[PDB]
A and B are shown apart, each in its own frame.
Chain A
């Protein structure tokens, strides 16, 4: 598009970073992440701890889970597995429960340094409506 709808100055910081990465890298991961940054808050539904566990429970373990949305906690998920999640935002319950399981929490700018081309990443988004 042309301008992000958000008034967050750090969300405009991330759009500036992923505009540069989408232009100067063949990886369609950067183009997809940049498209979802421009999208509104309703079009980025929250993703729960239970939903990122099912997409991990296959042979997709040891991959950096990337969710360009907020991460919410599920009280019905009794045990959290070890997992590295990069997201826009984390709730306090979610952040504590990844850290209790031995996992790590990343931001999208820490993702861009580590995996600029989006290598070995599991991209997820939440339920629409």
Chain B
């Protein structure tokens, strides 16, 4: 019923949708690789899904959804710790997301890349703000 869910999600109502006037729609669901609402990146309408998230302690994880733990919403996600070395984390995506749709592999690598880049940017801002004292 994966397609029947998508038709209800796309064309009737979805609580995570944010409709903007700028020619693009956004998904507010926290387990989505891209913020956009499309068929590839809707985690509700894809029984098999992957997502890269960052913890408050600074750890980056990879989340896995399978069709088997679908009726159990508390056990939707397998949480796998990603390496701090950027190359081993990219490889860890490739082994774990093996035989997935290539959209999920390509966007999880992008989501891993932006999360590491923001973390480096976060440390450069905090160092400059401490020096500036404003």
Contacts and interface: CB of A to CB of B under 8 A. Distances in A.
Interface of A: 9-10, 12-13
If over half of B's interface residues share one DSSP class (helix, strand or loop), that class is named, otherwise mixed; here it is: helix
Interface string B1-44: 00110011000000000000000000000000000000000000
Contacts of A13: 3-4
Contacts of B4: 9-10, 13
Interface residues of B, number: 4
A61 B8 CA distance: 42
Nearest to A16: B3
B76 to A, nearest CB: 25
Contacts of A10: 4
B112 to A, nearest CB: 34
Nearest to A10: B4
- From A9, A10, A12, name the one whose CB has the most chain B CB atoms within 10 angstroms: A9
A112 to B, nearest CB: 15
Contacts of B7: 9, 12
